[PDB]
PDB file of all heavy atoms in Angstrom:
ATOM      1  N   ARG A 330     125.984 135.548  85.938  1.00  0.00           N
ATOM      2  CA  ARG A 330     124.976 136.432  85.427  1.00  0.00           C
ATOM      3  C   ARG A 330     123.782 135.534  85.246  1.00  0.00           C
ATOM      4  O   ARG A 330     123.964 134.367  84.814  1.00  0.00           O
ATOM      5  CB  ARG A 330     125.355 137.028  84.077  1.00  0.00           C
ATOM      6  CG  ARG A 330     126.594 138.020  84.078  1.00  0.00           C
ATOM      7  CD  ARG A 330     126.855 138.775  82.760  1.00  0.00           C
ATOM      8  NE  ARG A 330     128.186 139.431  82.785  1.00  0.00           N
ATOM      9  CZ  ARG A 330     128.410 140.694  83.073  1.00  0.00           C
ATOM     10  NH1 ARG A 330     127.361 141.533  83.384  1.00  0.00           N
ATOM     11  NH2 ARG A 330     129.694 141.167  83.100  1.00  0.00           N
ATOM     12  N   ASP A 331     122.608 135.969  85.627  1.00  0.00           N
ATOM     13  CA  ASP A 331     121.396 135.203  85.342  1.00  0.00           C
ATOM     14  C   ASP A 331     120.289 136.188  85.011  1.00  0.00           C
ATOM     15  O   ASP A 331     119.863 136.951  85.905  1.00  0.00           O
ATOM     16  CB  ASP A 331     121.036 134.403  86.608  1.00  0.00           C
ATOM     17  CG  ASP A 331     119.674 133.693  86.511  1.00  0.00           C
ATOM     18  OD1 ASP A 331     119.287 133.238  85.399  1.00  0.00           O
ATOM     19  OD2 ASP A 331     118.964 133.595  87.534  1.00  0.00           O
ATOM     20  N   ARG A 332     119.784 136.178  83.811  1.00  0.00           N
ATOM     21  CA  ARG A 332     118.650 137.007  83.407  1.00  0.00           C
ATOM     22  C   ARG A 332     118.801 138.525  83.752  1.00  0.00           C
ATOM     23  O   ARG A 332     117.857 139.168  84.214  1.00  0.00           O
ATOM     24  CB  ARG A 332     117.393 136.458  84.016  1.00  0.00           C
ATOM     25  CG  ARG A 332     117.029 135.037  83.480  1.00  0.00           C
ATOM     26  CD  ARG A 332     115.821 134.498  84.182  1.00  0.00           C
ATOM     27  NE  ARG A 332     115.981 134.431  85.649  1.00  0.00           N
ATOM     28  CZ  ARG A 332     116.194 133.312  86.315  1.00  0.00           C
ATOM     29  NH1 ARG A 332     116.307 132.135  85.647  1.00  0.00           N
ATOM     30  NH2 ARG A 332     116.348 133.318  87.633  1.00  0.00           N
ATOM     31  N   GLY A 333     120.015 139.012  83.617  1.00  0.00           N
ATOM     32  CA  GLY A 333     120.287 140.415  83.812  1.00  0.00           C
ATOM     33  C   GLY A 333     120.624 140.796  85.244  1.00  0.00           C
ATOM     34  O   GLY A 333     120.694 141.970  85.601  1.00  0.00           O
ATOM     35  N   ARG A 334     120.848 139.793  86.126  1.00  0.00           N
ATOM     36  CA  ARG A 334     121.394 140.154  87.418  1.00  0.00           C
ATOM     37  C   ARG A 334     122.449 139.172  87.793  1.00  0.00           C
ATOM     38  O   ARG A 334     122.636 138.171  87.138  1.00  0.00           O
ATOM     39  CB  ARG A 334     120.305 140.268  88.460  1.00  0.00           C
ATOM     40  CG  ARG A 334     119.349 139.142  88.543  1.00  0.00           C
ATOM     41  CD  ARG A 334     119.913 138.067  89.536  1.00  0.00           C
ATOM     42  NE  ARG A 334     118.856 137.262  90.164  1.00  0.00           N
ATOM     43  CZ  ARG A 334     118.086 136.404  89.522  1.00  0.00           C
ATOM     44  NH1 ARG A 334     118.190 136.223  88.202  1.00  0.00           N
ATOM     45  NH2 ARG A 334     117.180 135.669  90.195  1.00  0.00           N
ATOM     46  N   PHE A 335     123.128 139.421  88.928  1.00  0.00           N
ATOM     47  CA  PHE A 335     124.139 138.476  89.446  1.00  0.00           C
ATOM     48  C   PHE A 335     123.496 137.624  90.526  1.00  0.00           C
ATOM     49  O   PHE A 335     122.756 138.099  91.412  1.00  0.00           O
ATOM     50  CB  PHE A 335     125.351 139.216  90.004  1.00  0.00           C
ATOM     51  CG  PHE A 335     126.151 139.912  88.940  1.00  0.00           C
ATOM     52  CD1 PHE A 335     126.202 141.304  88.888  1.00  0.00           C
ATOM     53  CD2 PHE A 335     126.940 139.228  88.051  1.00  0.00           C
ATOM     54  CE1 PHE A 335     126.932 141.936  87.944  1.00  0.00           C
ATOM     55  CE2 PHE A 335     127.666 139.833  87.083  1.00  0.00           C
ATOM     56  CZ  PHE A 335     127.661 141.208  87.029  1.00  0.00           C
ATOM     57  N   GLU A 336     123.698 136.312  90.462  1.00  0.00           N
ATOM     58  CA  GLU A 336     123.060 135.395  91.374  1.00  0.00           C
ATOM     59  C   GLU A 336     124.143 134.635  92.079  1.00  0.00           C
ATOM     60  O   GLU A 336     125.056 134.147  91.398  1.00  0.00           O
ATOM     61  CB  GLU A 336     122.147 134.374  90.660  1.00  0.00           C
ATOM     62  CG  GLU A 336     120.729 134.746  90.607  1.00  0.00           C
ATOM     63  CD  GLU A 336     120.150 135.114  91.965  1.00  0.00           C
ATOM     64  OE1 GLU A 336     120.241 134.280  92.941  1.00  0.00           O
ATOM     65  OE2 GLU A 336     119.619 136.220  92.101  1.00  0.00           O
ATOM     66  N   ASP A 337     124.093 134.541  93.383  1.00  0.00           N
ATOM     67  CA  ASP A 337     125.096 133.885  94.145  1.00  0.00           C
ATOM     68  C   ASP A 337     125.126 132.372  93.849  1.00  0.00           C
ATOM     69  O   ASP A 337     124.122 131.750  93.658  1.00  0.00           O
ATOM     70  CB  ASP A 337     124.688 133.935  95.623  1.00  0.00           C
ATOM     71  CG  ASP A 337     124.917 135.363  96.233  1.00  0.00           C
ATOM     72  OD1 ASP A 337     125.590 136.157  95.602  1.00  0.00           O
ATOM     73  OD2 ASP A 337     124.405 135.599  97.332  1.00  0.00           O
ATOM     74  N   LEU A 338     126.342 131.767  93.814  1.00  0.00           N
ATOM     75  CA  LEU A 338     126.407 130.314  93.766  1.00  0.00           C
ATOM     76  C   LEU A 338     125.817 129.699  95.041  1.00  0.00           C
ATOM     77  O   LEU A 338     125.966 130.292  96.118  1.00  0.00           O
ATOM     78  CB  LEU A 338     127.922 129.877  93.631  1.00  0.00           C
ATOM     79  CG  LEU A 338     128.557 129.723  92.287  1.00  0.00           C
ATOM     80  CD1 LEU A 338     128.523 131.026  91.473  1.00  0.00           C
ATOM     81  CD2 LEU A 338     130.054 129.259  92.378  1.00  0.00           C
ATOM     82  N   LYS A 339     125.126 128.566  94.900  1.00  0.00           N
ATOM     83  CA  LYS A 339     124.547 127.846  96.078  1.00  0.00           C
ATOM     84  C   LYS A 339     125.670 127.484  97.078  1.00  0.00           C
ATOM     85  O   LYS A 339     126.731 127.066  96.622  1.00  0.00           O
ATOM     86  CB  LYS A 339     123.943 126.537  95.634  1.00  0.00           C
ATOM     87  CG  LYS A 339     122.698 126.614  94.742  1.00  0.00           C
ATOM     88  CD  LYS A 339     122.294 125.179  94.126  1.00  0.00           C
ATOM     89  CE  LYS A 339     122.763 124.983  92.600  1.00  0.00           C
ATOM     90  NZ  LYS A 339     123.265 123.587  92.233  1.00  0.00           N
ATOM     91  N   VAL A 340     125.506 127.610  98.369  1.00  0.00           N
ATOM     92  CA  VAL A 340     126.430 127.066  99.388  1.00  0.00           C
ATOM     93  C   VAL A 340     125.707 125.856 100.037  1.00  0.00           C
ATOM     94  O   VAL A 340     124.611 125.961 100.524  1.00  0.00           O
ATOM     95  CB  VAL A 340     126.789 128.168 100.451  1.00  0.00           C
ATOM     96  CG1 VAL A 340     127.817 127.588 101.449  1.00  0.00           C
ATOM     97  CG2 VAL A 340     127.382 129.434  99.785  1.00  0.00           C
ATOM     98  N   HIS A 341     126.310 124.677  99.957  1.00  0.00           N
ATOM     99  CA  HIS A 341     125.602 123.464 100.354  1.00  0.00           C
ATOM    100  C   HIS A 341     125.664 123.105 101.769  1.00  0.00           C
ATOM    101  O   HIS A 341     126.621 123.437 102.477  1.00  0.00           O
ATOM    102  CB  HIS A 341     126.102 122.242  99.525  1.00  0.00           C
ATOM    103  CG  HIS A 341     125.671 122.269  98.080  1.00  0.00           C
ATOM    104  ND1 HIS A 341     124.555 121.626  97.616  1.00  0.00           N
ATOM    105  CD2 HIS A 341     126.281 122.850  97.007  1.00  0.00           C
ATOM    106  CE1 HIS A 341     124.445 121.861  96.280  1.00  0.00           C
ATOM    107  NE2 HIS A 341     125.471 122.591  95.894  1.00  0.00           N
ATOM    108  N   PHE A 342     124.568 122.472 102.227  1.00  0.00           N
ATOM    109  CA  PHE A 342     124.506 121.831 103.551  1.00  0.00           C
ATOM    110  C   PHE A 342     124.688 122.727 104.804  1.00  0.00           C
ATOM    111  O   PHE A 342     125.091 122.259 105.875  1.00  0.00           O
ATOM    112  CB  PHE A 342     125.521 120.659 103.560  1.00  0.00           C
ATOM    113  CG  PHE A 342     125.229 119.657 102.479  1.00  0.00           C
ATOM    114  CD1 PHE A 342     126.194 119.447 101.485  1.00  0.00           C
ATOM    115  CD2 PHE A 342     124.109 118.896 102.491  1.00  0.00           C
ATOM    116  CE1 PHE A 342     125.979 118.453 100.471  1.00  0.00           C
ATOM    117  CE2 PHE A 342     123.840 117.957 101.453  1.00  0.00           C
ATOM    118  CZ  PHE A 342     124.789 117.742 100.495  1.00  0.00           C
ATOM    119  N   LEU A 343     124.439 124.004 104.659  1.00  0.00           N
ATOM    120  CA  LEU A 343     124.439 124.938 105.840  1.00  0.00           C
ATOM    121  C   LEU A 343     123.307 124.725 106.778  1.00  0.00           C
ATOM    122  O   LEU A 343     122.209 124.420 106.363  1.00  0.00           O
ATOM    123  CB  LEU A 343     124.338 126.394 105.357  1.00  0.00           C
ATOM    124  CG  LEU A 343     125.380 126.811 104.315  1.00  0.00           C
ATOM    125  CD1 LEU A 343     125.227 128.334 104.068  1.00  0.00           C
ATOM    126  CD2 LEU A 343     126.750 126.516 104.845  1.00  0.00           C
ATOM    127  N   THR A 344     123.553 124.870 108.090  1.00  0.00           N
ATOM    128  CA  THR A 344     122.476 124.913 109.091  1.00  0.00           C
ATOM    129  C   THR A 344     121.788 126.282 108.950  1.00  0.00           C
ATOM    130  O   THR A 344     122.342 127.145 108.275  1.00  0.00           O
ATOM    131  CB  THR A 344     123.017 124.701 110.490  1.00  0.00           C
ATOM    132  OG1 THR A 344     123.978 125.770 110.763  1.00  0.00           O
ATOM    133  CG2 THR A 344     123.805 123.439 110.577  1.00  0.00           C
ATOM    134  N   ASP A 345     120.622 126.438 109.570  1.00  0.00           N
ATOM    135  CA  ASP A 345     119.983 127.766 109.611  1.00  0.00           C
ATOM    136  C   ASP A 345     120.897 128.888 110.106  1.00  0.00           C
ATOM    137  O   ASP A 345     121.012 129.906 109.460  1.00  0.00           O
ATOM    138  CB  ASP A 345     118.651 127.733 110.375  1.00  0.00           C
ATOM    139  CG  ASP A 345     117.553 126.950 109.635  1.00  0.00           C
ATOM    140  OD1 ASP A 345     117.772 126.654 108.458  1.00  0.00           O
ATOM    141  OD2 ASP A 345     116.530 126.609 110.269  1.00  0.00           O
ATOM    142  N   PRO A 346     121.499 128.725 111.311  1.00  0.00           N
ATOM    143  CA  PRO A 346     122.414 129.803 111.784  1.00  0.00           C
ATOM    144  C   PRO A 346     123.573 130.035 110.815  1.00  0.00           C
ATOM    145  O   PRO A 346     124.033 131.165 110.701  1.00  0.00           O
ATOM    146  CB  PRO A 346     122.943 129.270 113.077  1.00  0.00           C
ATOM    147  CG  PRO A 346     121.896 128.252 113.527  1.00  0.00           C
ATOM    148  CD  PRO A 346     121.443 127.604 112.266  1.00  0.00           C
ATOM    149  N   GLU A 347     124.078 129.003 110.117  1.00  0.00           N
ATOM    150  CA  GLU A 347     125.174 129.235 109.193  1.00  0.00           C
ATOM    151  C   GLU A 347     124.694 129.992 107.980  1.00  0.00           C
ATOM    152  O   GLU A 347     125.321 130.897 107.458  1.00  0.00           O
ATOM    153  CB  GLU A 347     125.796 127.883 108.759  1.00  0.00           C
ATOM    154  CG  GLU A 347     126.724 127.294 109.818  1.00  0.00           C
ATOM    155  CD  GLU A 347     127.117 125.847 109.519  1.00  0.00           C
ATOM    156  OE1 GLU A 347     126.564 125.262 108.580  1.00  0.00           O
ATOM    157  OE2 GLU A 347     127.994 125.328 110.231  1.00  0.00           O
ATOM    158  N   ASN A 348     123.484 129.675 107.534  1.00  0.00           N
ATOM    159  CA  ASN A 348     122.924 130.291 106.365  1.00  0.00           C
ATOM    160  C   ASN A 348     122.701 131.790 106.620  1.00  0.00           C
ATOM    161  O   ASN A 348     122.852 132.608 105.717  1.00  0.00           O
ATOM    162  CB  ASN A 348     121.598 129.642 105.992  1.00  0.00           C
ATOM    163  CG  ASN A 348     121.123 130.069 104.660  1.00  0.00           C
ATOM    164  OD1 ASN A 348     121.788 129.797 103.660  1.00  0.00           O
ATOM    165  ND2 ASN A 348     120.017 130.730 104.590  1.00  0.00           N
ATOM    166  N   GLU A 349     122.388 132.153 107.834  1.00  0.00           N
ATOM    167  CA  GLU A 349     122.149 133.573 108.143  1.00  0.00           C
ATOM    168  C   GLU A 349     123.428 134.410 108.016  1.00  0.00           C
ATOM    169  O   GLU A 349     123.345 135.653 107.978  1.00  0.00           O
ATOM    170  CB  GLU A 349     121.566 133.708 109.582  1.00  0.00           C
ATOM    171  CG  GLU A 349     120.242 132.973 109.809  1.00  0.00           C
ATOM    172  CD  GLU A 349     119.031 133.673 109.190  1.00  0.00           C
ATOM    173  OE1 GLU A 349     119.222 134.516 108.303  1.00  0.00           O
ATOM    174  OE2 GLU A 349     117.881 133.380 109.642  1.00  0.00           O
ATOM    175  N   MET A 350     124.582 133.733 107.935  1.00  0.00           N
ATOM    176  CA  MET A 350     125.844 134.446 107.903  1.00  0.00           C
ATOM    177  C   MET A 350     126.759 133.863 106.791  1.00  0.00           C
ATOM    178  O   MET A 350     127.961 133.806 106.920  1.00  0.00           O
ATOM    179  CB  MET A 350     126.569 134.363 109.270  1.00  0.00           C
ATOM    180  CG  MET A 350     126.903 132.964 109.761  1.00  0.00           C
ATOM    181  SD  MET A 350     127.881 132.975 111.307  1.00  0.00           S
ATOM    182  CE  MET A 350     128.004 131.269 111.692  1.00  0.00           C
ATOM    183  N   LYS A 351     126.101 133.556 105.706  1.00  0.00           N
ATOM    184  CA  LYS A 351     126.749 132.889 104.581  1.00  0.00           C
ATOM    185  C   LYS A 351     127.949 133.702 104.066  1.00  0.00           C
ATOM    186  O   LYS A 351     129.004 133.147 103.804  1.00  0.00           O
ATOM    187  CB  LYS A 351     125.646 132.749 103.530  1.00  0.00           C
ATOM    188  CG  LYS A 351     126.067 132.026 102.261  1.00  0.00           C
ATOM    189  CD  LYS A 351     124.828 132.105 101.277  1.00  0.00           C
ATOM    190  CE  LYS A 351     125.128 132.896  99.993  1.00  0.00           C
ATOM    191  NZ  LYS A 351     124.537 132.235  98.786  1.00  0.00           N
ATOM    192  N   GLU A 352     127.789 135.013 104.009  1.00  0.00           N
ATOM    193  CA  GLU A 352     128.861 135.860 103.498  1.00  0.00           C
ATOM    194  C   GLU A 352     130.082 135.825 104.462  1.00  0.00           C
ATOM    195  O   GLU A 352     131.241 135.690 104.034  1.00  0.00           O
ATOM    196  CB  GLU A 352     128.447 137.328 103.252  1.00  0.00           C
ATOM    197  CG  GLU A 352     128.687 137.859 101.797  1.00  0.00           C
ATOM    198  CD  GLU A 352     128.939 139.399 101.741  1.00  0.00           C
ATOM    199  OE1 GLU A 352     128.393 140.131 102.582  1.00  0.00           O
ATOM    200  OE2 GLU A 352     129.723 139.839 100.798  1.00  0.00           O
ATOM    201  N   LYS A 353     129.822 135.903 105.733  1.00  0.00           N
ATOM    202  CA  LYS A 353     130.896 135.767 106.719  1.00  0.00           C
ATOM    203  C   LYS A 353     131.587 134.376 106.576  1.00  0.00           C
ATOM    204  O   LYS A 353     132.796 134.264 106.654  1.00  0.00           O
ATOM    205  CB  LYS A 353     130.406 136.029 108.125  1.00  0.00           C
ATOM    206  N   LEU A 354     130.803 133.299 106.387  1.00  0.00           N
ATOM    207  CA  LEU A 354     131.519 132.001 106.245  1.00  0.00           C
ATOM    208  C   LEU A 354     132.396 131.942 105.032  1.00  0.00           C
ATOM    209  O   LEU A 354     133.500 131.404 105.071  1.00  0.00           O
ATOM    210  CB  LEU A 354     130.551 130.812 106.282  1.00  0.00           C
ATOM    211  CG  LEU A 354     129.862 130.608 107.629  1.00  0.00           C
ATOM    212  CD1 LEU A 354     128.828 129.544 107.550  1.00  0.00           C
ATOM    213  CD2 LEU A 354     130.923 130.308 108.668  1.00  0.00           C
ATOM    214  N   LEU A 355     131.903 132.396 103.858  1.00  0.00           N
ATOM    215  CA  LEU A 355     132.602 132.445 102.593  1.00  0.00           C
ATOM    216  C   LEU A 355     133.936 133.187 102.828  1.00  0.00           C
ATOM    217  O   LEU A 355     134.988 132.723 102.479  1.00  0.00           O
ATOM    218  CB  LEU A 355     131.765 133.132 101.527  1.00  0.00           C
ATOM    219  CG  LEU A 355     130.589 132.245 101.034  1.00  0.00           C
ATOM    220  CD1 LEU A 355     129.679 132.947  99.980  1.00  0.00           C
ATOM    221  CD2 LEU A 355     131.087 130.819 100.413  1.00  0.00           C
ATOM    222  N   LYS A 356     133.882 134.272 103.588  1.00  0.00           N
ATOM    223  CA  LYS A 356     135.113 135.040 103.788  1.00  0.00           C
ATOM    224  C   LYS A 356     136.117 134.379 104.711  1.00  0.00           C
ATOM    225  O   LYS A 356     137.274 134.652 104.641  1.00  0.00           O
ATOM    226  CB  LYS A 356     134.808 136.503 104.201  1.00  0.00           C
ATOM    227  CG  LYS A 356     134.150 137.304 103.040  1.00  0.00           C
ATOM    228  CD  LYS A 356     133.784 138.765 103.342  1.00  0.00           C
ATOM    229  CE  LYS A 356     132.825 139.152 102.214  1.00  0.00           C
ATOM    230  NZ  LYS A 356     132.549 140.577 101.911  1.00  0.00           N
TER     231      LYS A 356
END
Side-chain angles (χ1 to χ4, degrees), chain A residues 330-352 354-356:
Chain A
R330 292 189 194 262
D331 173 34
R332 297 177 301 257
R334 50 88 153 66
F335 293 112
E336 264 309 305
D337 287 345
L338 271 58
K339 293 170 259 142
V340 183
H341 290 264
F342 303 117
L343 304 186
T344 59
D345 291 346
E347 283 168 351
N348 193 62
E349 301 284 19
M350 60 175 176
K351 184 184 115 139
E352 236 209 329
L354 293 174
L355 286 177
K356 291 179 196 197

